[PDB]
Structure 1
Amino acid sequence: LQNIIYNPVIPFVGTIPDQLDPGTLIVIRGHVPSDADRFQVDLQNGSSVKPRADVAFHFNPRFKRAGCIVCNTLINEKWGREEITYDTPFKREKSFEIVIMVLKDKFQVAVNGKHTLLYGHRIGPEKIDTLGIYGKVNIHSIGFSF
């Protein structure tokens, strides 16, 4: 892996070091703290806060009750239609590895070595230049393969 970021402070907002062409991997290794209610990994168009930057792909594990992963897109400061995956691998106090693979038509995401979900593109992935990680999460490394 390339352009590896170690132990970033959260919230993390960083420029992705190359375009997200088909076959690109984003690999994120981390841990969920015991007090976590949710965290998110956002692939964004820029880093503006006011107005809020468009989020092509919001990947949002939530830990209340049996948990879930909520995926969505933010356009013009407005959330679209949620795609919720209830078969969630994440747990409070457990370590994880997320692999986001960018394909022509969709994102393909594996967690802890097992296929987890697909998310069809809503914003062209060529519009993505920024990776954001927010919420209650401990990140050990972020790595890229272009």
Structure 2
Amino acid sequence: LQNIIYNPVIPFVGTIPDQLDPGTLIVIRGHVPSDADRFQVDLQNGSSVKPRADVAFHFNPRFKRAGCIVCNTLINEKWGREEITYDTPFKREKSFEIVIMVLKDKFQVAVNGKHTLLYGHRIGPEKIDTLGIYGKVNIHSIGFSFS
């Protein structure tokens, strides 16, 4: 992998060092603490907080009850229609690997080597230049494979 970041402080906000062209991978390895409620991986158009940077792809594992993953997009500080996946591989106290693959029409995400979900583009992926990781999660490494 390319442009690897080790043991970042959370919240992490970093510039993605090349374009997210089809076939590009974002690989995030970490673990979920025992008290986690949720965490998220946000692919953003910049890092502004005011107005808040648009979020092309919000990938949001939630741990209450049986758990799920919520995905959405934030445009001009308004969330769109949530996409929910109930078949969640994440668990408190367990390590994980997330691989986000950028495709022409969508993202595809695999967790722990297994296909997890698709998310159709709502913002042009060319507008994504920033990776945010927030919430109750421990990140070991972030790396990229650019196409």
- TM-score, length-scaled by structure 2: 0.99
**Offset of residue 3 of structure 1:** 0.2
**Offset of residue 29 of structure 1:** 0.2
**Offset of residue 76 of structure 1:** 0.2
Partner of 1:5, secondary structure, is strand
Matched residue count: 146
Equivalent runs, 1:77-116 vs 2, <5 Å: 77-116=77-116
**Offset of residue 10 of structure 1:** 0.2
**Offset of residue 20 of structure 1:** 0.2
**Offset of residue 67 of structure 1:** 0.1
**Offset of residue 32 of structure 1:** 0.2
Structure 1: 5+ residue stretches without partners: none
**Offset of residue 46 of structure 1:** 0.3
Runs of 4+ in 1 over 2 A off after TM superposition: none
* Partner deviation per Cα, 1:26-66 (whole Å, 9 max, x = no partner): 00000000010000000000000111000000000000000
**Offset of residue 140 of structure 1:** 0.2
Partner of 1:46, secondary structure, is strand
**Offset of residue 16 of structure 1:** 0.1
Partner of 1:126, secondary structure, is helix
**Offset of residue 112 of structure 1:** 0.2
**Offset of residue 24 of structure 1:** 0.2
Structure 2: 5+ residue stretches without partners: none
**Offset of residue 124 of structure 1:** 0.3
**Offset of residue 118 of structure 1:** 0.2
**Offset of residue 110 of structure 1:** 0.1
**Offset of residue 79 of structure 1:** 0.1
Whole-Å Cα distance in 1 between the matches of residues 46 and 95 of structure 2? 29
Whole-Å Cα distance in 1 between the matches of residues 90 and 67 of structure 2? 8
**Offset of residue 107 of structure 1:** 0.1
- Per the alignment, residue 72 of structure 2 pairs with 72
- TM-score, length-scaled by structure 1: 1.00
- Per the alignment, residue 45 of structure 2 pairs with 45
**Offset of residue 19 of structure 1:** 0.5
RMSD over aligned Cα atoms:
0.3
